Ligand binder design. Structure first.
Ligand code: HEM
Ligand SMILES: [Ca+2]
Ligand SMILES: [Ca+2]
Length: 306
């Protein structure tokens, strides 16, 4: 069983070392908190939160970094290396990369203004990476609500609250134009924009992402508070201002009878959202972890110990 006090004796300063690393990085890269939270999400959705995503290529297995959902998208790996080195110095061979990334995600959320809580710990590191599983398990922005629900259920998160609350991770961070081009100019081969996208916001997005323009250009997930972790993400959905298809579907899908009330509840109360986010985050962090003597305490998060 995972427990929040796992390192209280072996490395009581781990959370502080992680926080310091992120605070320092945020000065030069204001996007790092969002990036780190996302790394944890992509770690947990592939064989569980086992730091499998941090592994680099080997001649026996491919890195998850080349998955469709990670390639030219996932970022912040060197920052994780930095905090890992710092933690290894303070507490040699004690904190797993899986746990380190979980703490980093929570601290990132808190630093960005979100809730503060102690995450369950005791996870251990994978002995391999899973590229095919990552391509199969990571959801995509073009997924329908039924597909989003399927993706979450596939990894063990059955609750619509899990999906609606965790999607709140899009209250900050960036998204490439490439992922919304269809919504802006030709949605579902209709030759028309996605009707669930507010027409005024549509104009703004078209200006940021012109047809035949730079598909790698970045746009903010939350037009209200781009870098602050808050419940504004849901207020946007209520106004048809969710950035990607998967965001807006939580409020506009024909299958959203169960998610609409959740979106409203989170938009109406920061407390309700924050409580749900912590609850869902801990559930996601409890997805098929390696514990006890299973796996290792990886020394270099990029390679399995030898
Ligand atoms: C429900 C399905 C989800 C889909 C389809 C999805 C999709 C995406 C996409 C397309 C991007 C843009 C990537 C890029 O342009 O490079 C992204 C970024 C991001 N996602 Fe999600 N996401 C989902 C769930 C989540 C969850 C559960 C979290 C975390 C709790 C999360 C946190 C983030 C963050 C913070 C970013 C910004 C990262 C950065 O700026 O570096 N996402 N997501
Ligand atoms: Ca993983
Ligand atoms: Ca925000």
């Amino acid at each position: 069983q995972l427990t929040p006090t796992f390192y209280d004796n072996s490395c009581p300063n781990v959370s502080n070392i992680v926080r310091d690393t992120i605070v320092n990085e945020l000065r030069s890269d204001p996007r790092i908190a969002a990036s780190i939270l996302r790394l944890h999400f992509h770690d947990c959705f592939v064989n569980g939160c086992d730091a499998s995503i941090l592994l680099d290529n080997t001649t026996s297995f491919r890195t998850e970094k080349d998955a469709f959902g990670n390639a030219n998208s996932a970022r912040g790996f060197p920052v994780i290396d930095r905090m890992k080195a710092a933690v290894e110095s303070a507490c040699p061979r004690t904190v797993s990369c899986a746990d380190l990334l979980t703490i980093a995600a929570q601290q990132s959320v808190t630093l960005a203004g979100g809730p503060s809580w102690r995450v369950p710990l005791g996870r251990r590191d994978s002995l391999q990476a899973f590229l095919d599983l990552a391509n199969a398990n990571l959801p995509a922005p073009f997924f329908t609500l039924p597909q989003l629900k399927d993706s979450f259920r596939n990894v063990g998160l059955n609750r619509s609250s899990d999906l609606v609350a965790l999607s709140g991770g899009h209250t900050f961070g960036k998204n490439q134009c490439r992922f919304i081009m269809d919504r802006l100019y030709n949605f579902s081969n209709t030759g028309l924009p996605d009707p669930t996208l507010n027409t005024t916001y549509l104009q703004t997005l078209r200006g940021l992402c012109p047809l035949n323009g730079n598909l790698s250009a970045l746009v903010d997930f939350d037009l209200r508070t781009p870098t602050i972790f808050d419940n504004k993400y849901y207020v946007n959905l209520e106004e048809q201002k969710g950035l990607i298809q998967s965001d807006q579907e939580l409020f506009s899908s024909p299958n959203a009878t169960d998610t609409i009330p959740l979106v409203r509840s989170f938009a109406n109360s920061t407390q309700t959202f924050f409580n749900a986010f912590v609850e869902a985050m801990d559930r996601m962090g409890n997805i098929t972890p390696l514990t006890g003597t299973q796996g290792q305490i990886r020394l270099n998060c990029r390679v399995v110990n030898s």
